[PDB]
């Protein structure tokens, strides 16, 4: 019944895809070719056109994403041809370079060979292609706590981190047939980072905060027409709150709010002073200012919500149902100042889409 | 089948209520009495003990309420004895006085006679017992836009507002048998208001903002054991964000953020400046400071969330399932700084509870 699931997904995808591409007349013959191919080989192979539009539809269907207005301009890189670790490594390096684009970030996805029969051809261990290591031992915490398990796994493979608060994790991935993943250090010339300063508060630089330019999610599966692309890293540019209200502020992440309060010169003693809220706003102002000053793409949550409003309007105008997850779409700073907060969204799952998958380590 | 719905709700309520009250042995005889009474009269009458605990359970089951830690100290006033408009009016005046308690607010509910056969005995028109009128005509907007329809209805009944931004609406309610509601002006001596000032920014008083002390919801139905108390106004004290991030900030309410930005001396020109977020924090700081300075009860969203965490713990320790609506429980200012944001809640409906009902006017 594996094949029947595949055939059914394929039928729905090809019909929808070709309809959007004005290719509806070709659906008939294409599906026949696909049915023979499944009968024969147990699977089928997407055309470049199908793969590209599939990855775009998958972004368009991502309920939790506020950035979807730009779904149709996704840059899709087809790497279904890779067979070696060196090719995978080089393709990941290339993704970083071309997505970064000297700071003018290009939303990009690199697509590797798909699962054959649930059997991965390439298995990426990183959560993002660029991320900081984390350490916790003898009560001492260093770096990003979110990376502790992956960092420990890396250090089992012969890697060693410098134990700064911002060590770049190496790329780590496993090839079909290999028992152990390989790891490769990131060339620093490929990785843009932004030091965090504040537009008005000179002392903010005393915190010595920085973040990386481009979030490149590398642990999710792209599913298109029943084909499972478990290895298909993708990136956008950041919304500022992701850095300033989550990565740097969260108590289980960099946990910087008390330090922020101190450098902006407010007490951190009384809940009624709303010092956490004030620190959050100033940290978030600093993040946006810093990315802008450096010429690295970023969007603030107000502008992002306005773009998302246009996405909603575009969907209605195209006759497409809109799906969304309110709990993820609202920004974590002043959510009620956005239109998103004041409406509801159908959280139904539509494919093609991106999905969570089990981690290959613990 | 009306009766069967009633009997079934009654059975579940009485069993649960008496169990919590350590009265489980009396459930048997009480249910027999109730069954006879329903057979006879089509309904049944709660004991004072049942009514009081029922209203408390209803608060405890209110999924959208962050204030539930204090459910068991609700002050329940039994006014099932009222028969005249003067008695209803006087009971509403009394509720305001005793709930206000010179600023040390007491969570209180006044319970009027229940619906007989869907037939209301008392029909309250106000959304809250204390609220400001709103006007919109010839492009001119005055007061609270949320009150526009009710205000227009009042002005059909012979009332006239002064058309300040803070006119107190009169009490308005209808008795069974009467075609028209009556209205009564609130004695100003009963109504505490708080002028909004900022702890550090002297100019904030130039905005001439104020709000009323006590939110007394008067348009919801209390349902206990199948009995429908459509008229049962209840109050708590405010959480500061309700005033500073909703009532005064919302574009469809008092819409004060641009004016706040001006008095705190920041530009309101660029989304990336996060001026709306900064204005929201300062307005919210001002609200808490002002209520505290005046000696009127209020809670900030951090303290409220910590209290709610204790409510969760208390529920687990008592063996009670917890229900909640994440979308209402998170505060609209720095939600991710509260524990609520980082967990999920079962939004199932448990009775006794408070419910929306159709408005008696348009
Ligand atoms: C172009 C700039 C982009 C911005 C500003 C953006 C913004 C965001 C934000 C802020 C979130 C997380 C919301 C939260 O934590 O509550 C998110 C989630 C997501 N975005 Fe986007 N995004 C962008 C591009 C992309 C692209 C190119 C894709 C894929 C092709 C994508 C797919 C997703 C997915 C799948 C999630 C959910 C991840 C999960 O469930 O863990 N986004 N986006
Ligand atoms: C003691 C102080 C109290 C505080 C601070 C408090 C806090 C709140 C807040 C902030 C909300 C709205 C959340 C939002 O808009 O997202 C709310 C909703 C609610 N509260 Fe409470 N509350 C308190 C007391 C009470 C009492 C005494 C009752 C009833 C006996 C009650 C029942 C409710 C109900 C029914 C709602 C939802 C209203 C609706 O659906 O429109 N609360 N509470
Ligand atoms: C492609 C892309 C671009 C872009 N700018 N941002 C993303 C999302 C990045 C992201 C990364 C992590 N580690 C966690 C979350 C959600 C954290 C989270 C967790 C839970 C549980 C709830 C919630 N609201 N948010 C989101 C993807
Ligand atoms: C007894 C009691 C005490 C206390 N402190 N606060 C309340 C709630 C008062 C309240 C009043 C109004 N008008 C609207 C909302 C919800 C506004 C709202 C609407 C929607 C649609 C979503 C959302 N999250 N919030 C809440 C009751
Ligand atoms: Cl991130
Ligand atoms: Cl209110």
- Please provide the DSSP assignment of A288-317 as one string: HHHHHHHT--EE-HHHHHHHHHHHHHHHHH
CA distance linking residue A65 with residue A59, whole number of Å: 8
Residue B146 lies in a domain: yes
Active site residue A68: yes
Same domain, B198 and B273: yes
Spatial contact of A231 and A123, defined as CB atoms under 8 Å apart: yes
Q: Is A245 on the interface with B (CB under 8 A)?
A: yes
Distance from CA of residue B96 to its chain's centroid?
13
Kindly state whether residues B231 and B285 are assigned to the same domain. Answer: no
Of B271, B278, B334, the CB nearest to A302: B271
Q: Is A20 left (phi over 0), alpha (psi -120 to 50) or beta?
A: alpha
Contact in structure between B227 and B44 (CB atoms under 8 Å):
yes
How far apart (Å, rounded) are the C-alpha atoms in residues B361 and A348?
A: 36
Q: Which technique was the structure solved with, according to the deposited record?
A: X-ray
3-state secondary structure B299-357: ECHHHHHHHHHHHHHHHHHHCCCCCCCHHHHCCCCCHHHCCHHHCCCCCCCCCCEEECC
Q: Shortest CA distance to A337 belongs to which of B241, B234, B48, B159?
A: B241
Write down how long chain A is: 362
With respect to residue B31, please indicate whether it lies within any of the assigned structural domains.
yes
Q: CA-based diameter of chain A, in Å?
A: 71
Q: Do B300 and A333 touch (CB under 8 A)?
A: no
- Per the listing, tokens 């060979």 go with A113
Q: Tokens representing A54?
A: 């599939």
Which amino acid residue places its CA nearest to atom 6 of ligand 2?
A: B67
Any catalytic annotation for residue B343?
A: no
Q: Regarding beta strands B134-137 and B140-143, do their DSSP bridges make them parallel or antiparallel, or are they unpaired?
A: antiparallel
Q: Check which CATH number belongs to the domain holding B152 and give it.
A: 3.90.440.10
Domain contains B342: no
Identify the helix (H) or strand (E) that includes residue A152. Answer: helix A148-154
Whether residue A88 sits in one domain with residue A48: no
**Which residues are A355's β-sheet partners?**
A221
Domain count, chain A: 3
The four Cα atoms B88, B92, B93, B97 give a dihedral, to 10 degrees, of: 150
Q: Examine residue A20 and state whether it is found in any structural domain, yes or no.
A: yes
Q: For residue B300, which residues of chain A lie inside 8 Å, CB to CB?
A: 271-272, 274
Residue A163 main-chain phi, psi, to 5 deg? 65, 40
Residues A112 and A231 in one domain: yes
Cβ-contact A238, B270 below 8 angstroms: no
Q: Hey, what are B104's tokens?
A: 């040390």
Residue B340 lies in a domain: no
In this structure, the answer to whether residues B137 and B89 fall within a common structural domain is: yes
Which tokens is B227 given? 């009995």
- Asked if A336's CB is within 8 angstroms of B334's CB, the reply is no
Q: How far apart are the first and last CA of chain A?
A: 31
Nearest alpha-carbon partner for A186 in A154, A139, A146: A154
Q: Report DSSP letters for B48-93, one per residue.
A: HHHHHHHHHHHHHT-TT-TTGGGGGG-EEEE-TT--SHHHHHHHHH
CA atoms within 13 A on the CB side of B136: 11
Can you give the C-alpha Rg of chain A in angstroms?
A: 22
Which chain B residues are Cβ-neighbours of A284 within 8 angstroms? 274, 277
Q: Is the alpha carbon torsion for B333, B339, B344, B345 positive or negative?
A: negative
Asked if residue B91 and residue B188 are part of one domain, the reply reads yes
Distance, CA B344 to ligand 1 centroid (Å)?
21
Task: Please name which ligand lies nearest the alpha carbon of B301.
Answer: 2
Same domain, B287 and B322: no
Does residue B236's CB lie within 6 angstroms of at least one atom of ligand 2?
Answer: yes
Q: What is the CATH number of the domain that holds B52?
A: 3.90.340.10
- Which is it for the CA torsion B213, B219, B225, B227, positive or negative? positive
CA distance B178 to B194: 37
CB contact under 8 A, A334 and B332: yes
- B257 and B230 share a domain? no
Q: Are residues A90 and A156 in the same domain?
A: yes
Residue B344 lies in a domain: no
Domain of residue A197, residue span = 193-215+238-303
Residue B248 shares a structural domain with residue B139: no
- Residue (of B277, B287, B167, B308) closest to B238 by Cα position: B287
DSSP state at residue A242 = I
Give the CA distances from residue B50 to residues A298, B24, B54, B81, B275, in Å, rounded to whole numbers and listed in that order. Answer: 58, 13, 6, 16, 51
Contact A333 B274 (CB under 8 A): yes
Asked, for residue B347, whether it belongs to a domain, the answer is: no
At residue B268, φ and ψ (nearest 5 deg) are -120, 50
Pairing of strands A298-299, A75-78: unpaired
Q: Answer yes or no: do B41 and B8 share one domain.
A: yes
In-domain check, residue B350: no
Q: Which residues of B touch A336 (CB under 8 A)?
A: 245-246, 249-250, 332
Q: Which two tokens stand for residue B331?
A: 């505060």
* Cis ω for the linkage preceding B279 (within 30 of 0): no
DSSP β-bridge partners for residue A212: A193
Q: Is there a single domain that holds both residue A100 and residue A57? A: no
């Amino acid at each position: 019944e594996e094949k029947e699931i595949l055939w059914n997904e394929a039928k729905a995808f090809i019909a929808a895809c070709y309809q959007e591409l004005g290719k509806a007349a070709e659906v008939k013959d294409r599906l026949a070719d696909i049915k023979s191919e499944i009968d024969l080989t147990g699977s089928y192979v997407h055309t470049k056109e199908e793969l590209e539009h599939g990855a775009k539809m998958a972004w368009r269907n991502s309920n939790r994403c506020i950035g979807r207005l730009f779904w149709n301009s996704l840059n899709v890189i087809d790497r279904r041809d890779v067979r070696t670790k060196e090719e995978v490594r080089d393709a990941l390096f290339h993704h970083i370079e071309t997505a970064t684009n000297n700071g003018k970030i290009r939303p990009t996805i690199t697509i590797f060979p798909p699962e054959e029969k649930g059997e991965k051809q390439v298995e990426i261990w990183n959560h993002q292609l660029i991320r900081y290591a984390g350490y916790e031992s003898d009560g001492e915490r260093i770096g990003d706590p979110a990376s502790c398990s992956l960092t420990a796994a890396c250090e089992e493979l012969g890697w060693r981190g410098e134990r700064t608060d911002f060590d770049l994790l190496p790329l780590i991935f496993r090839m079909k047939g290999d028992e152990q993943p390989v790891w490769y250090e990131l060339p620093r010339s490929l990785v843009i980072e932004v030091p965090i300063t504040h537009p008005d508060i000179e002392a903010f630089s005393d915190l010595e905060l920085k973040w990386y330019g481009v979030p490149i999610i590398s642990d999710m599966k792209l599913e298109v027409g029943g084909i499972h692309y478990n290895a298909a890293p993708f990136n956008g540019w950041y919304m500022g709150t992701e850095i300033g209200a989550r990565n740097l502020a969260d108590e289980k992440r960099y946990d910087k709010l008390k330090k922020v309060a101190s450098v902006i010169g407010i007490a951190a003693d009384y809940n009624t002073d709303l010092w956490k809220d004030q620190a959050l706003v100033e940290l978030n102002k600093a993040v946006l200012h810093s990315y802008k000053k450096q010429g690295v793409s970023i969007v603030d949550h107000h502008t992002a919500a306005s773009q998302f409003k246009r996405f909603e309007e575009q969907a209605e105008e195209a006759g497409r149902k809109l799906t969304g997850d309110w709990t993820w779409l609202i920004p974590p700073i002043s959510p009620a100042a956005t239109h998103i907060f004041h409406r509801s969204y159908d959280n139904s799952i539509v494919k093609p889409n991106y999905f969570y998958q089990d981690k290959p380590y613990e």
